[PDB]
Structure formats: C-alpha cells, structure tokens
Design a protein around this ligand. Structure first.
Ligand SMILES: [Mg+2]
Ligand SMILES: [Mg+2]
Ligand SMILES: [Mg+2]
Ligand SMILES: [Mg+2]
Ligand SMILES: [Mg+2]
Ligand SMILES: [Mg+2]
Ligand SMILES: [Mg+2]
Ligand SMILES: [Mg+2]
Ligand SMILES: [Mg+2]
Ligand SMILES: [Mg+2]
Ligand SMILES: [Mg+2]
Ligand SMILES: [Mg+2]
Ligand SMILES: [Mg+2]
Ligand SMILES: [Mg+2]
Ligand SMILES: [Mg+2]
Ligand SMILES: [Mg+2]
Ligand SMILES: [Mg+2]
Ligand SMILES: [Zn+2]
Lengths: 90, 51, 154, 120, 134, 93
RNA sequence: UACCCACACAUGGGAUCAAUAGGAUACCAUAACGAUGAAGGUCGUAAUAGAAUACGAAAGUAUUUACCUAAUUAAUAUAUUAAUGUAUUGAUAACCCUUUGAACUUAAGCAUAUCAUUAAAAGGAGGAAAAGAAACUAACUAGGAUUUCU
RNA sequence: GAGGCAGUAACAAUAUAUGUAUAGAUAUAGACUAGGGUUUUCAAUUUAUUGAAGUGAAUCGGUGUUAUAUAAAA
C-alpha cells in the first residue's frame, strides 16, 4: 500500500553534517551540501528574501570587526616598546 | 546503536548536559525565586535529529 | 481563597471548612450534596457510608437523562437513583475535619447542624485523543470547589 | 593576591621557576575540592596569578627581538614586528611618489609663483 | 542609546534609560548629598558623593530631624540605610528605613581609602575656575 | 617555527586530580592501580611518561576511557608493591 | 421534585480606562573587511550551573586567541639562483560600470505593438563611481569642456 | 473565550481469615545490524521527580585493497 503500511520501510538516512555551514544538509551520495554547496569555493545564493536575515553579517560573534570599528571612533592604544622600535625603521 | 563515529558521540554528550532543571543553590536567590526551566525535552516525545 | 456566600450572624459557634479544585467530577458531587442541608452531622456520616456499600441511593434531579429505575428511590418519592463511589469519599473527608475542630474548641458534637452547602465550577485541565482518519479531539476534565459550613442548634 | 610589579623585578631565569611553583599550587587546590572543602574565592585568585606571570614573560622576550632587528629596511624584518594598518593601506603608494611630476610642469610653475592681492 | 550613553535630550524615555542603565563613575554622582553651612566655609563647593560611615542628618520627609550613621550602600537601588530609623514589616518594626540620598545632608565626614586626597583635589580645581573669569 | 614560542609542556598540565569513587578504591588495594583524570587531547604514551615523573614510581601499562560526561579517565598500573597506597595517602585522597 | 420569572450574594473570563528601559518615519555625520588568516560554524572554560550572555587551555569579565572555514606543504602567473621572494582567490543584499534577458498585464479577442533598454541571473571597483577639454550648436549685431536643478 | 446535545456514544474491570505464600489465566523464547540516546543500576519522595555511580582491548569492529580519473562496518 501507499499509506500506513509503507512507512515502516523508512530506516535509511541520507543527509549528514556539513563542515562549513553546520546544517544537516550534506548529501552523502551526491557529495554536495544542499544549503551552502560545500566543495565549491563561493557560497550559494539563498533561496528567498527571509533567508538573508537568518545568517547575516552581525548576528555572529565578530571577533575582529568589533576591534576595527572601535579604533575608528577612539584612537588606538599603542605599545611603548613597539612605538620606540618603529621610529628606528629606515 | 553501539557503533558510533567520533562526531556522533561528541554531539550526543553535549545534548545530554543541556537537559536539566535549575539547580537548587540558584533557586534561593531573589532573582530565581519562582522561575523554572522551559526548554526541557522528553526522549520519547521529540527526537533530536543527529543521525 | 474562595469566599463564602454565607452571612454569619454569630462569629462564635460557626465552623467552616473548604477544599479548592478537587479532582472529582462536578455533575456527580452536585447530585449527592442536594439532600445534606438541614440535617444532623451524625446522620450525614451514617448516610454516606450506605452509599458506598450500596444500601441507599441518591436521587438524580437536575442531570438525570438516562438513569435506571430502582425501588430504593421510593423513600424520596422518586423513580431514579444511582450510587456514586468517588464523589462520596470526597465529601466524607470534609465532614471528618469539621468534627475535629469541634472537639478542639470544646463544642458539643450532637448539637451541630449543616447550614450552608454549595459547590461551584473550576478551571479546566486539558487533554487529547486520536480518532479515526487522523483527527484530534479534546479530552479534558472539569474539577469543582467544595464549600461547607456547620452551625450549632439553638 | 600578587602584584604585576613584582614580576617585572625578577630575572628571566627566575621568572620560570615561579610558573612551575604556581602550577604546583593549583594541583593541591583542585584535589581539595574533591575530598574536602574549599573556600568560595580560593581557586580564582590562583588562576589569575599565572595569567599575570605569563604576560610579563611574553614582554621580556619581545624586547630582545627589537635589539636584534634595530636598524634595517622594512623588507628585512619579520612580518609580525611590522606595523599594521589594513590591507588596503599597505597597497597604497606613498605621498612622495604621488606628487612627482614631469620636467615640463615643475620647471614652469617655478617661474610664476602665487600672488596675494586685494579687493575688486 | 545602548547603555550609559549620557545624552542631551528632552524626551521622557530617553532620559530615563540613562538613569537605569548607568555604570561607572556616572552611577556614583547620582547619589550625592548637600553640605552643611559650616562645612561649606571650609572647602567651598556645594556637594560631594557619599561613602560609608559618615554622620548624616535628614532634612526632608517623614523622618525629618533625626541624625545617624550610614550602615549600608546599595548601588543597584540608589538607597541607603541610616541609624536610628525604624520601618514596619509583617513581623516587627526592627527593619531599618531605606532613603534616597538627595534628602539628606551630612555633618561630619569619614576619611578612608584616600578620602583626604580627593577632597583637596576638588578644592584646588574650584578656585582656578574663578580666576579664569575675572 | 615562530618567533616567540610557548613554554614547554609540563606534567602539571596533563594530570588534573585523583578519582575517589568506590570502584577506584577497589582498584587501589587488590590490583595496585591508580585511577586518574587526564586531559582529553593527550595519548597513552605521554600519560605513562608523566606519571613516572610526578610521583617517582615506575608505571607499566595505562588503559584509557572516555565516559559519558565528557571526561577522560586512565587506569595506571604500578610496578612495585605498596606504591598506590602510599601515593593516595600523601596526595590527600 | 422538575420547568419559568424577580432580587441579593459568590464562581468563570480578560474587555474598558490609565501608565511604557519597545517600534515607525524624516534629516545630519561616517562610509573603517580579508594569506600579518575575514565573515560564519563546532567543541570547551563559572568554587557550588540549566536557558540567555561574555570569553579561548593566559578561557563567565595591553597581551593571548582551541578545531573546521578562500583554507593554502595548494592553484594561475612573474623574478632570481628543484629551492626562495612578490601579486590574485573569500564576504556584500543600498548607490555605480559592463554581459545576458522573460512572461503575467493593456489593446474590452489576437499574431506587429505595450509592460521593458524592467524583474530574476552573472562579472568588476570606490567612498562616491561614470563623464570631461568640440573631426560642436547655429543662420544671429552670433555662442563656447563635463555634471545637476527650473 | 465559553454552551446545548450529555455525564450520552466509545473503551477498562482474576480467587482466598493471614499473603516476600497457595492456586487460576493469557502469550513460543533468545541473540548480531539499521534506527533510539541515559531509558542502565542504586537511594529518597510518589512506566513519575531529584541526586550519585557506571562503559578498561597487540589477537572484537573501523582506520587498509579494489568493482575495468571521488564507491563496501556481509
Ligand atoms: Mg528500501
Ligand atoms: Mg541513493
Ligand atoms: Mg546507528
Ligand atoms: Mg516513535
Ligand atoms: Mg441508555
Ligand atoms: Mg480511538
Ligand atoms: Mg495515522
Ligand atoms: Mg580503549
Ligand atoms: Mg501589474
Ligand atoms: Mg487582451
Ligand atoms: Mg478583459
Ligand atoms: Mg486571452
Ligand atoms: Mg525594448
Ligand atoms: Mg565628485
Ligand atoms: Mg573618476
Ligand atoms: Mg467492554
Ligand atoms: Mg532515571
Ligand atoms: Zn553546508
């Protein structure tokens, strides 16, 4: 049958983790992520308008860009050992 | 199923740790006097999707 | 903290007791408690024990569509009767607690009478069921509040 | 507690013996947590002592590197000691290179300089 | 308008967010108190922030007139407790009262943790402001 | 390979403490073995070399384990008799 | 006893009114990424720790920065003598320059036409970009590189 | 958010005067893989809630070779 009698036969799993995005959308036979398209260098364009909200620039941790913005507003504190050395460069 | 890879075990250990009620030493504080956890799950109701 | 609808003229010699949101069906405890008012407290505990051992019946008056006839309901000039178990055990626990406060305040047990008996509805507790062709229907239950006051005779 | 001033006093060889003796102190404290009682602020002061001690060591090796590469051009020194601004600025050409001009232009403007004059 | 932004604004909600989410030295200066007249002759400024253990006197409110020493300071609530004052609870009246430090004037100081160094630094900076004007 | 290096790996970095369970106490007396808790990233060869540096007693074989709570435990056999009772007494267990 | 009406007192539910560390629109300034390892992810660190939040074995308050990731003991090219040095690769969701390019719809039907030098898609840079010093406009008593407004 | 129909349809209901036992009744049972992930064991309070403990490999699986320019837990 098509209904209740055939849902017992579903015990095979096809998608696994991806290395780059972290979602469970990496096909193990086609060898390609269905969300980020992993083995290619460039990332995939998302499917809808709401999909650009979910992982944009700024919902993360921003380990580096938090620093770069902070030197724009306030000046950078310098190391005095490094400051004396750069004046001795030719 | 007693035959796991490395990634499946490391993800499964972390998912066991996060299913816990609030400890009793924190509940005596004024902040958490009546507050309780809402993100608990049951092992028979909802599945974890780890594969 | 349900308030009573009883108007107390004398603060002494009036004993109150209360259970809030008891896990008994509402339509069955209403049927048992309709004939407890204007009775002695000793006659009530003897009467409710006969309902558990099926020797006296309860006359169904308000919610009575589909009840079997019996001969034990001739004492009330009626023709319908039933013997609910779990509703009678919940009312028996209330009447024992009134008897204990009377001996603590030193009152006389025989002189007491039942004066104010009312019950009312309570908020629900929801449930679930799974029917044919994959549809889901509610399966909830309905508790009640129980309020009883006792007064000495003159 | 320990001050950051006392670590700057000592020698390089004397700095290393402290880090091991501080690391031995954390071992006996952690065993006390399992088999006994531990005061509610005792481990945290011991962990922050080693973080202050390692930071003086990283500064003392760095001043040795500056004396070795003191007077050289920029392509001789390692890339970590180079000054960093951003990637788009390192590829920009200098102020001296941008203002150089052809001999037909700078010879002409030297003959007719600027004049300061008054109202109309 | 994140937290502790210290703005020049006239809206009701923008100014009140700076009162709740202030931190640092800005939280200290909200809890200041008025000087006595004889203390004003010694130094010359108007007010100064409040520390623990100096003798104060209430000048307004239902507790008017009483004088006591400071027992606690609560930075998260902008409240203090003064000796000799009682407040009713559901069991007793032994609870000390909680007051805002804008209703109190202090009479005698308390010199701890370099307190004399700070007071003499303000008295130097005040008179230089007067010499700029003339 | 870098200019300024990290310091050397010291045996206080690998061993954390000594387990004090009921199953660990049976392994001390009847079989002269020590039950330690180590860090997760180190292998079998470096664990056995560290134990003979700390307590000064030779260790022969080490069986490791990763339990369900995320730790890593080691079962360290000792060569000479009476070592494990002496070590656990001086360490305070 | 049940059915109906009137009055007084108690249950059930969250409408009305008042407040508010939240949003919406317009204007002004800025227009700072990445092989010196970015954006994003996985796992760990609290004296008694779950969610949230901050942080990397120096880990729950001026340096360090675990493992994947353009992810690189490489690839396409240049210079010196198989080795060494130099330059490019990834992110964008507004404005700018090229390539490719529809149909729904209107014509009261429809096939040239319109929607349209548009939407989607691809390539390339900057705080702006593109354009710019007549192998022009005019028929007057003649004007004078580009851009923007009426 | 809460009614009528309505406590109506539809489902569950072994014996002993003293018992950690004497009897009755229904159902074949046990191991590897795919899937599940602490349900395991014990203690305390009433198929629940909280807290501890528990998985040890030179010879048992993977990591190795290939199926005529990415393939095997038989
Ligand atoms: Mg199949
Ligand atoms: Mg397939
Ligand atoms: Mg499996
Ligand atoms: Mg299921
Ligand atoms: Mg019937
Ligand atoms: Mg059914
Ligand atoms: Mg179904
Ligand atoms: Mg092993
Ligand atoms: Mg249209
Ligand atoms: Mg048409
Ligand atoms: Mg039409
Ligand atoms: Mg048509
Ligand atoms: Mg066209
Ligand atoms: Mg411009
Ligand atoms: Mg240009
Ligand atoms: Mg049946
Ligand atoms: Mg359990
Ligand atoms: Zn992916």
């Amino acid at each position: 049958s098509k209904g209740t009698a055939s849902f017992g036969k579903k015990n095979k799993r096809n998608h696994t983790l991806c290395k780059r995005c972290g979602k469970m959308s990496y096909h193990k036979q086609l060898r390609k992520c269905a969300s980020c398209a992993y083995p290619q260098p460039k990332m995939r364009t998302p499917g809808s308008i709401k999909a650009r909200r979910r992982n944009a620039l700024g919902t993360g941790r921003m380990r580096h860009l938090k620093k770069v913005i902070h030197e724009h507003v306030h000046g950078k504190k310098v190391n005095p050992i490094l400051a004396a050395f750069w004046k001795t460069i030719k | 199923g007693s035959r796991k890879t490395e990634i499946i075990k490391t993800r499964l250990v972390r998912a066991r740790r996060s299913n816990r009620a609030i400890p009793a030493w924190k509940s005596e504080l004024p902040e958490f006097k009546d507050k309780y956890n809402m993100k608990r799950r049951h092992w028979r109701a909802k599945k974890l999707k780890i594969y | 903290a349900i308030n009573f609808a009883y108007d107390v003229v004398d603060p002494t010699k009036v004993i109150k007791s209360q259970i809030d949101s008891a896990r008994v069906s509402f339509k069955k405890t209403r049927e048992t408690a309709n004939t407890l008012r204007k009775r002695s407290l000793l006659n009530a505990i003897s009467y409710l024990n006969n309902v558990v051992v099926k020797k006296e019946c309860v006359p169904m008056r308000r919610y009575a569509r589909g009840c079997g006839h019996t001969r034990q309901a001739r004492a009330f000039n009626q023709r319908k009767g039933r013997w609910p178990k779990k509703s009678a055990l919940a009312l028996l626990q209330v009447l024992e607690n009134i008897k204990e406060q009377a001996v603590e305040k030193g009152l006389e047990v025989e002189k007491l009478d039942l004066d104010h008996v009312q019950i009312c509805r309570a908020p629900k507790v929801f449930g679930r069921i799974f029917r044919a062709h994959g549809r889901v229907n509610p399966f909830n239950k309905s508790p009640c509040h129980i309020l009883v006051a006792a007064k000495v005779r003159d | 507690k320990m001050d950051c001033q006392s670590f700057r006093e000592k020698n390089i060889s004397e700095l290393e013996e402290e880090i091991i003796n501080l690391k031995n102190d954390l071992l006996q404290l952690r065993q006390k947590k399992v088999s006994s009682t531990v005061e509610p602020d005792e481990i945290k002061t011991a962990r922050k002592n080693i973080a202050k001690a390692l930071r003086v060591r990283h500064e003392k090796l760095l001043e040795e590197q500056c004396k070795k590469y003191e007077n050289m051009p920029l392509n001789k020194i390692p890339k970590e000691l180079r000054p960093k601004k951003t990637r788009a600025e390192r590829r920009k050409l200098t102020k001296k290179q941008a203002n150089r001009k052809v001999p037909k232009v700078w010879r002409r403007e030297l003959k007719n300089p600027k004049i300061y004059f008054a109202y109309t | 308008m994140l937290a502790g932004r210290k703005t020049k604004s006239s809206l009701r909600k923008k100014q009140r967010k700076a009162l709740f989410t202030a931190v640092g030295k800005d939280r200290l200066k909200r809890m200041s108190s008025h000087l006595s007249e004889e203390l004003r002759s010694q130094y010359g400024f108007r007010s100064f922030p409040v520390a623990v253990g100096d003798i104060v006197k209430v000048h307004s409110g239902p507790y008017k007139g009483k004088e006591g020493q400071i027992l606690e300071v609560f930075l998260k609530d902008y409240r203090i407790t003064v000796e000799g004052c009682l407040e009713e609870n559901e069991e007793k009246e032994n609870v000390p009262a909680k007051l805002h430090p804008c209703n109190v004037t202090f009479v005698k100081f308390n010199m701890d943790n370099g307190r004399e160094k700070q007071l003499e630094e303000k008295k130097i900076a005040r008179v230089q402001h007067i010499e700029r004007e003339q | 390979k870098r200019i300024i290096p990290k310091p050397d790996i010291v045996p206080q970095d690998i061993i954390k403490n000594i387990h004090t369970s009921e199953k660990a106490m049976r392994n001390v007396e009847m079989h002269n073995t020590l039950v330690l808790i180590v860090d997760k990233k180190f292998n079998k060869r470096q664990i056995r070399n560290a134990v003979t540096k700390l307590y000064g007693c030779p260790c022969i074989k080490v069986n490791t384990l990763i339990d369900f709570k995320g730790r890593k435990k080691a079962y360290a056999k000792l060569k000479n008799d009476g070592d494990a009772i002496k070590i656990a007494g001086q360490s305070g267990a």
